[PDB]
Amino acid sequence: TGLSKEELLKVAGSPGWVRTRWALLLLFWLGWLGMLAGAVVIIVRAPRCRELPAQKWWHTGALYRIGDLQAFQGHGAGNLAGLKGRLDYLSSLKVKGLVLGPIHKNQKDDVAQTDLLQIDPNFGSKEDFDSLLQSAKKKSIRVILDLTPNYRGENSWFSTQVDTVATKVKDALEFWLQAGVDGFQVRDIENLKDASSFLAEWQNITKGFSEDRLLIAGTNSSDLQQILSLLESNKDLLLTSSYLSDSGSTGEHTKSLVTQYLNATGNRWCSWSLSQARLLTSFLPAQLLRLYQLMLFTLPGTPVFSYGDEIGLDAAALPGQPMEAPVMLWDESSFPDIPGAVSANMTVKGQSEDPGSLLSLFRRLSDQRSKERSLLHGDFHAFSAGPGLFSYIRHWDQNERFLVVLNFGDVGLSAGLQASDLPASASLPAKADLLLSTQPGREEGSPLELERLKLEPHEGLLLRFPYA
Amino acid sequence: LLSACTIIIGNIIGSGIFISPKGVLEHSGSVGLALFVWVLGGGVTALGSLCYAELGVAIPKSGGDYAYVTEIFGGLAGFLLLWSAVLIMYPTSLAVISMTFSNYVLQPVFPNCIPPTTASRVLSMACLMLLTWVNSSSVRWATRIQDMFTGGKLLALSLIIGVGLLQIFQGHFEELRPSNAFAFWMTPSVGHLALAFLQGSFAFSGWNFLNYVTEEMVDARKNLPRAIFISIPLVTFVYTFTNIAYFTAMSPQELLSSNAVAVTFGEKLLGYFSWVMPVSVALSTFGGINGYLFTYSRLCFSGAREGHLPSLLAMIHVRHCTPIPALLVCCGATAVIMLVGDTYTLINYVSFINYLCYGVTILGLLLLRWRRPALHRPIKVNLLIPVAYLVFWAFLLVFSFISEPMVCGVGVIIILTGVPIFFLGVFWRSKPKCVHRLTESMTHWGQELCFVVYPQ
Ligand SMILES: *[C@@H]1O[C@H](CO)[C@@H](O)[C@H](O)[C@H]1NC(C)=O
Ligand SMILES: *[C@@H]1O[C@H](CO)[C@@H](O)[C@H](O)[C@H]1NC(C)=O
Ligand SMILES: *[C@@H]1O[C@H](CO)[C@@H](O)[C@H](O)[C@H]1NC(C)=O
Ligand SMILES: *[C@@H]1O[C@H](CO)[C@@H](O)[C@H](O)[C@H]1NC(C)=O
């Protein structure tokens, strides 16, 4: 080996190397201190996290309306106990609430006889209701009770005086918060006079027991001005209405409707549905369902769906089912009135195995809506679209940004995305990852361009891109 | 017995338990699969530890992997393993621990958004340089400081386990029930399982460091198997219980969304006392870095005792008796590595190469069994352990090569570049006088600058 001895090193390292060693040590310490000072400098002047909004329970997913239990299960199984067995499928849909009822006593057009505090024995006993509520609570499926005073008659609020009806409604609310329901729903408030006052009082009472309860109101008004009359005094009231009843089959018209409704109310929480107690398929053709579902699941609000809306159940294309409550189809034997009239393509059994079925899109969209922060409470911004397109951006803080493009037309078009309508923190990138499209024939996970993208007729694209 | 069991527990528990749970779960796809991957590692470590104990009692030479392989395979394999350990294993482990420290310190300031990368890197380098200076200044300071950090990490683990048990007794085990435990949000493939095991094996890394002190062990023959049997199951139980506490305190989706699982635990459970844990976690990371540096030095010494590394790396300070050049080289290598990769890519690198080295050593054990059947061995293990470990290692290596070719290929290439250096330096013994003059000049420059002499 070759090295210097200890005494030799002490002889050699004495004269001037001490100064060099001390200078290097001081330089190292100064560099370390400057490093720490810089660390503090960037830490202080860094952009700050945005605060969470503390969402309620009717904010993180859709609701599922069940107009009548008789048609949900079929003959011989339309009971609360039978519905207790469907919670597996309902949780598979990833819903966050059930609009159940009415189940209260209403024989025919009799104010005194109509009791809102007693359960009709035909739909089950109170013990069945308690068991169903407990089972749903264990599975995190909140239950909302419908409280329409008259559902078996033409008038939903009786032709006589209504103050006794209001007292009965209030007693029903107090009783069912004793029972443990997580909200209420009333329908056909048009026929109700001075409905704003009763709605305010009922919100008052319902919120008086806890802050985790809600009241839902429904009406058939299709004009914008009337809804603001009801919402001018109540600000935490979900109001479902036929605001999107007319189709038009035009992207620009739907964009105008949505933007005007949002701007008129500001940015308050809303509910997106085409009716109060009707399916999507009543006003839409077959090809528009896969697009309307994406639009509903990608808009800021709480989507509201009816039963059979995930499999495209229709009553106008299958004789033997009333339009008010079509019989839900689970397999080929669900409709025995006309044998051989159903296909294993329009049942739940025949669509749980097909990736290309509508139920798969429903489940994927529900899963995406129920987990991603941007879809949960992100800001919604719409920019210039094409001849018949409707495009918008969902963005929250630093999370993944989402872009939605929808084509309501029947003729192939191009993207035509125009900038200078979004904040500086949500500028569109040149290339964005593609999540999904409403029709087969598109490659998922492939980064698509945003300057030459072409639209197939009746197609919608959902795309992602991280913070940029 | 208990004299060495303490060290076995100490070297295994670093900071991997504060990093792996997010990495494993994302690849496991369910609570049950992850909590099974943990126990799998807890047995694969035990098998390798038993085989290593057999090798260590077979050859009384100290040095661990470097000493055994050189005895069995020859100079080339020993030099290649030393090259891999010096360049990849230790620097990447140090970089991972430093990045974890920076993440845990910066998380409370930015709870919902990721912290800036520049500040995190600068803070990690500040911590690493401070610990390097501390290790260069003295040795007794380093020993006492390491003991205090070990106390801190044990306190943190005990607190987490206790809070988890208290929550369990309160009737909050929704995720642990079979209805929710086996809720697969992604179908787990074989390659994803291999990647999950690579991520989860980082928590057990460092179990072979005991073999570095075998010469200092009194009556290794009896205490070594007892130490292994006492230690490895206890470590597996502690890790599994900590994972159980994590899952009972927070949901898997929100667990995957956090850059510091422990910090989220402390925020939601400890309340006002939350600030207690991230400090107590940070000490743990400190206790990693320091400790690793020590082993690094005790490797370089050996690397010069066999004439594989330049002697300048083995010299100690004249006054303080500290190995300055080894620490300087380690700090430089770790700083270079930190700029390139992310935490989990580095974890994949180090886990892949660690398993490659373990498999090579076990195959060397088998070759020694074949070649020298008359060697006196105090303890003899059945062939089942080496054959099962070899099969598992081969499957894991091929599956990880298939899953992530780039990082494993880079590691293999870096290992393969060590052959020409060995052939040019040690195999080639006809060095021109220019090379000798350059080596002597660099050694003299290092000696004069760092004020170091060869150990006596
Ligand atoms: C609800 O009732 C309480 C008690 O009378 C009152 O203080 C509160 O202002 C009411 N809220 C609304 C929105 O009317
Ligand atoms: C809405 O209700 C009013 C009042 O009963 C009725 O005249 C009108 O036809 C209804 N509109 C629709 C679209 O059903
Ligand atoms: C909403 O109203 C404001 C105020 O009149 C106006 O500036 C804005 O352009 C309106 N937005 C839309 C989409 O019509
Ligand atoms: C399946 O259902 C769709 C939608 O109603 C229909 O267009 C198609 O023809 C059906 N296919 C078969 C094979 O019956």
Side-chain angles (χ1 to χ4, degrees):
Chain A
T1 187
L3 51 98
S4 294
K5 324 322 171 313
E6 193 260 11
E7 309 89 342
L8 214 174
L9 179 54
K10 268 181 184 295
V11 166
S14 275
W17 290 84
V18 166
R19 189 185 304 279
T20 290
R21 148 179 266 269
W22 210 65
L24 285 166
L25 191 83
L26 202 73
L27 195 50
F28 157 85
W29 269 118
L30 220 66
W32 187 78
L33 277 170
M35 196 152 277
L36 263 192
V40 164
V41 152
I42 311 97
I43 283 295
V44 154
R45 326 178 44 73
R48 197 34 63 102
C49 260
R50 287 210 55 188
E51 201 246 348
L52 287 199
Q55 263 162 352
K56 294 285 170 68
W57 67 271
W58 72 102
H59 280 7
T60 51
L63 309 172
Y64 198 97
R65 287 181 300 205
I66 303 183
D68 196 36
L69 305 98
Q70 276 318 88
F72 198 42
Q73 277 96 28
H75 298 255
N79 249 326
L80 291 163
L83 191 33
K84 183 182 319 163
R86 301 300 192 190
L87 261 295
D88 39 18
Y89 164 65
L90 269 56
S91 178
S92 75
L93 295 161
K94 304 263 294 160
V95 301
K96 293 308 193 178
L98 298 184
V99 180
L100 182 137
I103 50 195
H104 69 71
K105 167 30 54 185
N106 174 27
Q107 192 77 80
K108 188 70 184 311
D109 254 358
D110 199 354
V111 186
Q113 157 272 326
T114 300
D115 196 359
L116 288 54
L117 331 172
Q118 96 75 40
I119 296 284
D120 194 53
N122 284 353
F123 302 86
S125 60
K126 210 165 191 274
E127 291 100 55
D128 284 9
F129 197 108
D130 304 340
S131 195
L132 174 53
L133 186 44
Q134 275 311 315
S135 290
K137 184 172 261 163
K138 190 197 71 212
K139 289 167 188 294
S140 316
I141 299 305
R142 288 88 175 184
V143 174
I144 300 170
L145 177 59
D146 200 351
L147 252 175
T148 296
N150 189 11
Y151 46 111
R152 288 182 215 292
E154 71 295 19
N155 197 331
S156 302
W157 300 98
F158 294 150
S159 196
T160 46
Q161 41 90 356
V162 317
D163 78 330
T164 48
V165 187
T167 318
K168 276 165 185 297
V169 164
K170 289 171 247 314
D171 300 357
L173 327 184
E174 64 92 38
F175 197 175
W176 299 125
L177 292 301
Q178 320 313 320
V181 310
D182 294 34
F184 295 94
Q185 166 162 310
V186 290
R187 314 187 330 210
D188 256 17
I189 54 193
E190 164 52 47
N191 313 120
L192 196 55
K193 270 71 142 173
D194 202 23
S196 56
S197 291
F198 311 76
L199 260 54
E201 307 156 49
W202 296 333
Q203 179 103 253
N204 217 194
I205 301 151
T206 303
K207 296 285 194 198
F209 274 61
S210 197
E211 199 46 352
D212 273 27
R213 317 263 198 267
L214 92 169
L215 183 87
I216 287 195
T219 184
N220 50 335
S221 266
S222 58
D223 56 54
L224 200 185
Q225 319 285 354
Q226 273 183 303
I227 306 182
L228 277 293
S229 70
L230 286 88
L231 299 165
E232 89 187 0
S233 308
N234 315 349
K235 304 212 173 182
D236 320 328
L237 179 93
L238 290 201
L239 188 39
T240 71
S241 100
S242 296
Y243 180 60
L244 307 184
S245 89
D246 72 81
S247 186
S249 65
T250 36
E252 291 305 8
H253 188 233
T254 299
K255 171 171 170 184
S256 67
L257 269 56
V258 170
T259 41
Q260 270 155 289
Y261 169 65
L262 269 152
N263 174 42
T265 194
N267 305 78
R268 302 241 288 287
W269 210 250
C270 306
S271 100
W272 298 116
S273 59
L274 323 185
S275 312
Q276 55 199 337
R278 297 298 263 283
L279 322 178
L280 298 166
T281 204
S282 296
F283 327 117
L284 305 191
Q287 57 270 0
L288 276 181
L289 259 63
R290 286 179 140 260
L291 167 84
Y292 259 70
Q293 279 187 17
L294 168 59
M295 157 167 121
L296 255 63
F297 270 108
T298 37
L299 274 182
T302 306
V304 176
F305 293 105
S306 295
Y307 78 106
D309 257 22
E310 73 283 13
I311 67 163
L313 166 63
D314 184 18
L318 172 43
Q321 307 183 119
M323 254 150 209
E324 317 88 62
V327 184
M328 181 65 148
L329 314 170
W330 309 94
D331 55 76
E332 37 265 50
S333 47
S334 284
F335 192 8
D337 292 349
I338 304 194
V342 317
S343 160
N345 146 33
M346 346 183 325
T347 77
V348 179
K349 197 203 151 54
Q351 288 175 245
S352 298
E353 68 194 283
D354 188 13
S357 53
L358 181 63
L359 208 160
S360 100
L361 186 52
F362 192 101
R363 266 173 181 157
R364 201 149 54 165
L365 282 158
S366 199
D367 175 33
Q368 280 270 314
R369 171 64 157 78
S370 271
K371 57 187 277 301
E372 202 65 50
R373 202 174 290 185
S374 292
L375 295 185
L376 280 178
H377 52 73
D379 273 345
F380 153 90
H381 270 98
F383 51 82
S384 305
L389 295 177
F390 179 49
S391 41
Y392 44 101
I393 311 188
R394 309 293 303 286
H395 56 92
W396 171 257
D397 206 10
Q398 313 274 0
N399 298 94
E400 179 102 9
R401 280 81 162 90
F402 279 72
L403 183 57
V404 181
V405 173
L406 314 156
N407 187 2
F408 294 78
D410 66 325
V411 165
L413 310 176
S414 298
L417 311 182
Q418 303 325 113
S420 150
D421 204 10
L422 303 317
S425 50
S427 50
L428 302 91
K431 200 159 44 58
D433 303 334
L434 182 72
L435 229 43
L436 54 102
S437 182
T438 79
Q439 79 258 63
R442 276 294 200 164
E443 39 269 43
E444 282 135 9
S446 59
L448 272 47
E449 85 283 4
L450 295 198
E451 42 272 358
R452 269 185 299 110
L453 173 132
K454 309 173 52 178
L455 276 311
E456 196 262 327
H458 296 106
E459 142 192 55
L461 301 153
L462 169 57
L463 318 86
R464 284 172 24 153
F465 52 100
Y467 181 54
Chain B
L1 201 47
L2 291 322
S3 150
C5 275
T6 301
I7 217 169
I8 305 197
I9 305 312
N11 35 58
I12 296 203
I13 298 162
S15 74
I17 192 55
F18 306 121
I19 304 139
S20 297
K22 174 188 169 313
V24 157
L25 176 61
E26 147 169 15
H27 277 288
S28 72
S30 50
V31 169
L33 207 43
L35 269 54
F36 163 71
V37 171
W38 277 108
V39 197
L40 194 42
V44 184
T45 291
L47 298 191
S49 191
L50 278 157
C51 294
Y52 263 67
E54 193 269 353
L55 257 170
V57 310
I59 307 149
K61 193 51 207 62
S62 268
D65 318 307
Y66 178 69
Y68 306 147
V69 168
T70 297
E71 152 73 28
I72 301 170
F73 289 159
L76 170 54
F79 179 88
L80 284 178
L81 181 172
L82 169 63
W83 193 251
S84 67
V86 156
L87 291 203
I88 314 140
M89 291 169 50
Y90 294 68
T92 294
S93 297
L94 280 173
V96 163
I97 294 155
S98 305
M99 292 149 109
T100 297
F101 160 77
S102 61
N103 286 346
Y104 273 67
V105 158
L106 283 194
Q107 164 80 4
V109 197
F110 306 95
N112 287 296
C113 46
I114 65 149
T117 44
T118 315
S120 184
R121 290 180 179 153
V122 153
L123 191 64
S124 274
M125 272 153 216
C127 162
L128 181 67
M129 281 169 182
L130 177 53
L131 270 193
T132 295
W133 181 87
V134 163
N135 269 255
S136 285
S137 177
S138 186
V139 191
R140 55 226 208 278
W141 294 1
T143 312
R144 302 181 202 103
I145 285 305
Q146 170 59 32
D147 273 12
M148 175 253 277
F149 292 161
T150 306
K153 66 184 57 189
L154 83 82
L155 163 155
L157 285 166
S158 95
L159 167 65
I160 284 195
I161 294 171
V163 175
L165 275 178
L166 281 169
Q167 292 264 309
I168 272 283
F169 287 138
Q170 255 175 42
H172 318 313
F173 44 94
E174 288 301 293
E175 301 91 321
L176 298 171
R177 276 199 317 286
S179 38
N180 318 65
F182 309 82
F184 287 59
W185 58 74
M186 158 204 140
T187 64
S189 69
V190 153
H192 276 256
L193 207 60
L195 284 179
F197 203 67
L198 279 194
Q199 295 287 337
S201 164
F202 188 71
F204 295 93
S205 88
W207 51 271
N208 52 349
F209 288 170
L210 170 55
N211 295 117
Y212 287 64
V213 317
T214 294
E215 269 171 353
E216 302 189 2
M217 171 156 298
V218 200
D219 183 350
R221 185 255 215 182
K222 313 185 187 187
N223 329 313
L224 208 45
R226 260 145 292 273
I228 292 175
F229 287 124
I230 277 166
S231 294
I232 301 308
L234 178 131
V235 169
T236 313
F237 276 173
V238 158
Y239 283 171
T240 279
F241 290 158
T242 295
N243 263 247
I244 275 169
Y246 285 158
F247 277 117
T248 63
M250 91 193 48
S251 46
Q253 184 28 257
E254 96 184 26
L255 186 144
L256 215 164
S257 325
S258 184
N259 289 139
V261 187
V263 152
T264 312
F265 173 95
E267 249 154 42
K268 285 165 159 181
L269 264 286
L270 302 187
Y272 173 66
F273 270 102
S274 67
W275 70 249
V276 156
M277 192 206 68
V279 165
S280 159
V281 171
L283 293 188
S284 165
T285 52
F286 277 114
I289 294 174
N290 182 91
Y292 260 96
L293 284 167
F294 252 93
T295 57
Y296 201 88
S297 57
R298 252 177 310 271
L299 171 73
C300 282
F301 283 40
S302 179
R305 202 45 72 172
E306 311 252 18
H308 276 104
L309 304 181
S311 46
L312 170 61
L313 281 85
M315 281 145 188
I316 70 154
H317 192 218
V318 189
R319 233 160 283 135
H320 314 147
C321 296
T322 65
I324 307 172
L327 302 170
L328 293 207
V329 169
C330 204
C331 189
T334 319
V336 152
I337 280 179
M338 202 164 337
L339 301 210
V340 169
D342 187 36
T343 315
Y344 295 97
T345 324
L346 294 196
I347 289 165
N348 285 350
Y349 272 97
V350 62
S351 298
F352 175 81
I353 276 166
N354 283 356
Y355 265 105
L356 182 71
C357 296
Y358 301 155
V360 167
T361 311
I362 300 288
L363 185 134
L365 171 153
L366 287 178
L367 224 50
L368 179 72
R369 158 144 310 127
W370 191 64
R371 275 213 218 158
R372 317 194 181 243
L375 217 175
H376 175 67
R377 321 199 187 145
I379 56 200
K380 190 150 180 14
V381 305
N382 316 91
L383 274 291
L384 312 168
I385 318 159
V387 300
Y389 193 96
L390 251 201
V391 164
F392 189 99
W393 166 79
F395 272 165
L396 194 141
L397 282 209
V398 281
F399 284 148
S400 181
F401 219 45
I402 287 164
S403 300
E404 292 199 34
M406 271 325 307
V407 303
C408 308
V410 166
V412 167
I413 280 153
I414 280 283
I415 286 180
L416 227 41
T417 69
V419 163
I421 308 141
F422 172 53
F423 276 147
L424 191 54
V426 202
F427 184 45
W428 158 281
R429 293 190 183 182
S430 303
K431 285 185 145 163
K433 297 180 193 157
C434 184
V435 186
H436 255 290
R437 166 59 169 192
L438 193 50
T439 316
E440 294 157 312
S441 191
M442 82 165 256
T443 309
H444 296 110
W445 270 48
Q447 272 218 252
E448 297 215 318
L449 179 51
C450 299
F451 201 70
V452 295
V453 317
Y454 202 94
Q456 284 182 236

